[PDB]
Amino acid sequence: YRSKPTHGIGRYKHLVKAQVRPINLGTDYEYGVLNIHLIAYDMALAESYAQYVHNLCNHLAIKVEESYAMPTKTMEVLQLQEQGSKMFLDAVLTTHERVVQISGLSATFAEIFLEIIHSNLPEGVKLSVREHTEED
Amino acid sequence: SPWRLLGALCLQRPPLVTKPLTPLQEEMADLLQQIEIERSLYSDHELRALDEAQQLAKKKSDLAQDLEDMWEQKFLHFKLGARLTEADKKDDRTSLHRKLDRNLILLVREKLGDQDIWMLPQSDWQPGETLRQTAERTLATLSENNMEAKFLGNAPCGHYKFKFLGAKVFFFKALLLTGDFSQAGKKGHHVWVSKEELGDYLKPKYLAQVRRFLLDL
Amino acid sequence: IPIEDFITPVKFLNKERQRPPVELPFEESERRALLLKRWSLYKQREHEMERSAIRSLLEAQEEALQELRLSSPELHAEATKRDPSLFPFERQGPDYTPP
Amino acid sequence: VARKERGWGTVWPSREFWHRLRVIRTQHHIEALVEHRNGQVVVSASTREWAIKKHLYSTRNVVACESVGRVLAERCLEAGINFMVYHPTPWEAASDSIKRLQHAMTEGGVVLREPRRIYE
Amino acid sequence: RRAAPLGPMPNEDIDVSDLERLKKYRSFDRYRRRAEQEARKPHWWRTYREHFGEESGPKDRVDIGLPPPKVSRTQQLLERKQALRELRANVEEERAARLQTARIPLEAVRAEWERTCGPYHKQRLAEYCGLYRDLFHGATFVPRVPLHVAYAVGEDDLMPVYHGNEVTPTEAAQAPEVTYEADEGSLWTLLL
Amino acid sequence: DCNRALLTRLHRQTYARLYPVLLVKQDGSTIHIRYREPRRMLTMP
């Protein structure tokens, strides 16, 4: 009740909010909206490393926004046969892609981060850092 | 308070080939193999192995093996690159091709007029220059080599001050993509070295704390 | 325009019949479980030295950058900014056999 | 014949009971309390307690929950209270540790689900 | 017309600016806990506790006791640490744990309980039943010496009197067997 | 640090048998791909 000392005790909605630019200042320099593309041939491997990345970010207080899978590209590899001169033979492969979006960074945290990411790189794992604009 | 300006560089070689596994990691790898193959659904190869192993017993009384042996011989015939290009030499610390498993770092030998210097490669930057530009410049110029090395940040790795005057040593991290070393037999002593060896060859307390921001792996 | 591969393919439906049996004695059961607990302790110590490592690195960053600011203010005008060179960072993971 | 507390029923759990079983699970210890609506703990069994701690192993195990339940049933009969209410969380009701806590409590002779009031 | 809060407002502590960098409890359960701890503190506004009779609230206790048994903290601690090392060492125990088969020797736990924290539990049961309220009126004592009372229901039958338990007057037609542990320089008085 | 996430199984509920395969791209380099075919090696031209 407005007249009382206890007014607004139940007030909550400012606590829970239920209702993009990199900021470069040259001294406090926040470079955000960054895309981590983890691409590898093995399903389990890419998933495990994407997982490791995700968890690493959550522990480092680095804010992850979106973690999602990119469409798999199916490769058909045509190998030359020696007997028949121009004769082709085939083997089937698949390329798997995962994505982890981080919303903020600083110079020092970029430097630190990349060290850990590439140091812990598993075999047959291709890593990419890019900018938020991409077209699915 | 005069300030002596010296840039510096920590040069990281990429570990090339993966490491062997800890006994625990190996037993765990075994377990993961077993349990993975335990929940697994059929196989195409195993459908054609088992269904035909069963159906041929019904064509006798009333393939898979070929493929197996084929792949066996095609694998066995083929041979692979050596995991050790270091210990077959066992000598060179100065070879850039030395260690496949770990990350390697560059050291240099200098004896100056008043001094004896074992040196993590150092730069000298004029006040008008950026620490970055002098890092790169000193890198490409000093080693007499063509190096593609992707740098990470515009921010430096670690800093150590020697005040006689006052002075600064600012170490940067450079990630080596592909180096081309010209005059592989040059007199200047360039030592490509791991973590333990970086602990060994380093006298100073300025270079002793470089293994503090180094990646131990 | 989303299309996921998380879906279970149609080939896998009726070929289910190939892997019915699984059985373990006291031996394999207790072995696997003991190994698992062991493994958890291990992975924990691993994460611990990992975090302590990146923490020591970040402390080297503190001492470093603060040293450079205390010396030359122009130098933390320069080096506290993040460069455009970091946009397309790409790195390949190690292999089993060198080329 | 006494008065339970009817009410609340915007909130949870129901405060209507004479006695309530309360099971708190720390990442280390399992603590089972018997409460009166006064908030006063009447009779309890905990795993921090040396009596239980020393006999058995791994304070956080399902084993520990069963144990604590048996101990608490014993101490409850000794206290003269045969009835109490237990209001678990839907996901706590599915969990094994708690199923077996309730089983121990039941074989112990303590009925959950208090008798009704008279002329309520 | 506003008034001014008296002392602290409950959530006034945490920063509204930058909500994303604040840790949340994504668990219903953590919330429940935090709330039940908040419900036990002495607030400055009219509350449930206040009206519904905490029964004198804060009370300075006149204590007519037997002096607490003096035991060395560090010694006890070491001994228990060791005992638990030993018990955790065995593989048999761990097998008993994973396979969900174990039992606790209830008689020995009842023994240790009677020896250790029993007096306090018996105390708060007495407080619950208001023994102290009708006897000494203000006074709380801790039952240091365990008292074992029993009735003979027959030749083989023994009905124990624990604190708070129910007994039928048929059982109690005769004087009970009473047992407690003391050497003799001692003198005691028993009362029903 | 290379062995960190290297040890794992595929977590999907219903899936075929996956078998270790050594894959040589055009380098001289070899990788380990889990592939449904038991063949110990494959190589790209």
Add this chain to the structure above:
RNA sequence: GUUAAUGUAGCUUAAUCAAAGCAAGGCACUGAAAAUGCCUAGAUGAGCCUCAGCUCCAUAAACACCA
């Protein structure tokens, strides 16, 4: 070598029933997190003493020092 302090598990309890709570881990569950379930490791800085006292060691913060 000097001053103001200390050495509880990663941060904070208790030290008259008792070394407590929270982080943090693993495996299971759904695509990742998250929740949940089943599990995991842990401390009173080290040496003596009296039934808080004396040192040592180490950190930290300064100064001196050393390069």
